[PDB]
Amino acid sequence: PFYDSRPPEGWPKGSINDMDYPLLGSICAVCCVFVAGSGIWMLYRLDLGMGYSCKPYKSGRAPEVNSLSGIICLLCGTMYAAKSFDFFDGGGTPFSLNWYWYLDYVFTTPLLILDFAFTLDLPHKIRYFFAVFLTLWCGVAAFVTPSAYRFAYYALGCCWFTPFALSLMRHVKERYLVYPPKCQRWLFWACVIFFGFWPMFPILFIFSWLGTGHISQQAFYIIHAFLDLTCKSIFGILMTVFRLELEEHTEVQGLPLNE
Amino acid sequence: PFYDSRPPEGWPKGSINDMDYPLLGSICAVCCVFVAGSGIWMLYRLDLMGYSCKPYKSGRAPEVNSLSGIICLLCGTMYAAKSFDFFDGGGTPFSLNWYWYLDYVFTTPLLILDFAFTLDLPHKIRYFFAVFLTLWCGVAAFVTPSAYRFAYYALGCCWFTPFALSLMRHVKERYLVYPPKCQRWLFWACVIFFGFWPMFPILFIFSWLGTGHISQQAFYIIHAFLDLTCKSIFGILMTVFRLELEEHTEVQGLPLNE
Amino acid sequence: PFYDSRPPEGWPKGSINDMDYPLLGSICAVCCVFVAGSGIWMLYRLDLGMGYSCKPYKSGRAPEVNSLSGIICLLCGTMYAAKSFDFFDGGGTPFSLNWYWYLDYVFTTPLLILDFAFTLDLPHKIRYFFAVFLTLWCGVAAFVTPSAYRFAYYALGCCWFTPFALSLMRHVKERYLVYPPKCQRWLFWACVIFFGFWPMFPILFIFSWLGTGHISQQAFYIIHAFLDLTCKSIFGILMTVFRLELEEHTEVQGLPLNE
Ligand SMILES: CC1=C(/C=C/C(C)=C/C=C/C(C)=C/C=O)C(C)(C)CCC1
Ligand SMILES: CC1=C(/C=C/C(C)=C/C=C/C(C)=C/C=O)C(C)(C)CCC1
Ligand SMILES: CC1=C(/C=C/C(C)=C/C=C/C(C)=C/C=O)C(C)(C)CCC1
Ligand SMILES: [K+]
Ligand SMILES: [K+]
Ligand SMILES: [K+]
Ligand SMILES: [K+]
Ligand SMILES: [K+]
Ligand SMILES: [K+]
Ligand SMILES: [K+]
Ligand SMILES: [K+]
Ligand SMILES: [K+]
Ligand SMILES: [K+]
Ligand SMILES: [K+]
Ligand SMILES: [K+]
Ligand SMILES: [K+]
Ligand SMILES: [K+]
């Protein structure tokens, strides 16, 4: 999808690409290591067994959708390794996972929402998946559009995220009462991350260089690195611990849900 | 995937991009509104089984039953993006109008999947990939500036001709199964399918990439009408067919003619 | 994704694109015909019935995942028809399935591994699918990267293929003892292809023009055409025959597996 490249003399001074590339690459490398390790731990813990007691699976293998958290974290860590390669190369490399904003997100966060929908048995999994997909593609279109019509694309995205976020939240409530207080605690701390950090991205768009111009692209990269540390890694760890508590309640102890 | 852009002085006069962009954008906006509303109604009606609105035993509809509305909403979102591109004068970096049939590789394969799920047609993956490859051959034909585009088109015609001849046969095998009311809705949906899907190959021949009889602006308008029919009207007919089938088999508990 | 094009005067003499394009196109056309015919035979044989006796399916149709071998072969044959179109056009065609190396592979070989995982009932099908996906995307990134960081991307790919290949192989062993000696023979000859030809691609990268410079891009295209003839077509035929033998053992004769 690439047409631009770093000029032979380097990025023009004062442009949005005139960033601290060693620092951005180091941040991306640290994020890659942390998120990939979190995904590896997620998959290893999933293969250990059900619940905190590590009860062996009857079929000998975990459910395939249960690997989504670790798979998404490992994919995000691989993309962050690629991002570190791009930043350490000075940016603007042909395979830049940093250039097109939210393009990487169209790969992780839809699946992430799918993982969420699978962990909480939320209805309309395909609907949520496609809502997230279209919101992220509207964001990509907004960030590649140089005219004012980018604010149209952003608005289009806000027309897909506002219902979805209001729908998911409602459904999450319907599931929250079902789970026991320990699984409820883990679910609460994960939903805090979800419904307090997913809205940040739309707000970050407004104050970015494509909006009011308060946040530079370098600061945007750092902020989104921290958000991916929270939205992928910490959220996936909270999902894994919630699943372990649920399996301990319902599979190891055989107790029923509050449904 | 984009390399071209609208020249600073505008599109060259007499080129295929020298179109009526306010008109194309208005048509795309109207199509966006209609298709998105049709998908919203499809999902709302799905969440309401059958005309009696019998509650689901699990409390939620089957996930594949949302495909019609999901596809219509995705097509409406793409038409909103198309209206943004046309109102910007075309050649916008995120142009869903530039690469022809590129948007279709997202909607119509899933659409065929939806069809295969509604009629319990065999070889759903086969049909999905046949549609996928036909549409990608069309994209390759439209981006190819040499005569080898007619090769790509031919390649697409090598994937659509069997598929359309296979699906039709399978549709016959399913048509006798359903009751006369579901048969009526299925007949009117299959009329749209087997009379409008062949139009695209014929439209290629007479387009600016063929004999040069249909301009790109007329192509955009014709395909907007086709997407109004192939996505929205077809999805409404599928939703009504599913409602009639659910009324026959779930609300009344009657068996199919199988 | 394309920015480059064949110069009006033709490819510069001595460049990596200064290849024998009629020969490459003829090879691609022959590969297209063979792989597409192999996929057509795979689907026809699958529709014939279960096993060598062609026992009719109880539901009247084959399992949908059983069509993966033929579907992948037909998709690869279609991409080879497109490759022949590109080569006969002189290369550098806007829709070039030859330009970006391993970009076509991100479509076939992940699904292929999925097919394998479905035929052998291997655990962690999503994990294997995403491992292959990320390995191939790392290869694409390495081949589009003009700096030394391509060897980073390659290394990243080697960080995803080395565990996966070591994991799959282990799981394959766990399945190998399950199947009868005839299915074991077909599985052995397919695993020979897998574990002796998949490692070739990483080795071919090192000696390619992007590495030590021993293998030209034309030779690379010919070698990968032969590999796709083996890794898609011959491997799919071996999978089809293994499935027929398994169906004859377990469905036609009703005999149990050695599990
Ligand atoms: C509404 C909206 C947006 C939404 C972004 C979201 C919801 C991003 C989530 C990212 C995550 C969860 C990343 C984790 O790895 C954009 C693209 C800013 C702009 C267009 C409209
Ligand atoms: C055979 C063939 C074609 C087929 C097109 C079809 C079958 C399109 C269907 C579109 C739909 C149903 C859109 C709805 O939103 C092309 C691409 C014209 C050209 C190459 C060969
Ligand atoms: C490890 C590695 C690679 C692996 C390639 C493989 C494993 C390719 C398989 C291809 C097949 C099976 C094709 C069949 O149609 C690359 C991309 C060379 C380079 C980066 C790292
Ligand atoms: K799960
Ligand atoms: K996991
Ligand atoms: K990332
Ligand atoms: K990018
Ligand atoms: K980015
Ligand atoms: K950028
Ligand atoms: K995760
Ligand atoms: K997660
Ligand atoms: K359905
Ligand atoms: K629907
Ligand atoms: K559209
Ligand atoms: K397009
Ligand atoms: K178009
Ligand atoms: K165009």
Ligand SMILES: [K+]
């Ligand atoms: K539809």
Ligand SMILES: [K+]
């Ligand atoms: K439909």
Ligand SMILES: [K+]
């Ligand atoms: K199979």
Ligand SMILES: [K+]
């Ligand atoms: K097959």
Ligand SMILES: [K+]
């Ligand atoms: K190929």
Ligand SMILES: [K+]
């Ligand atoms: K390519």
Ligand SMILES: [K+]
């Ligand atoms: K290639």
Ligand SMILES: [K+]
């Ligand atoms: K090339």
Ligand SMILES: [K+]
């Ligand atoms: K195959």
Ligand SMILES: [K+]
């Ligand atoms: K195969």
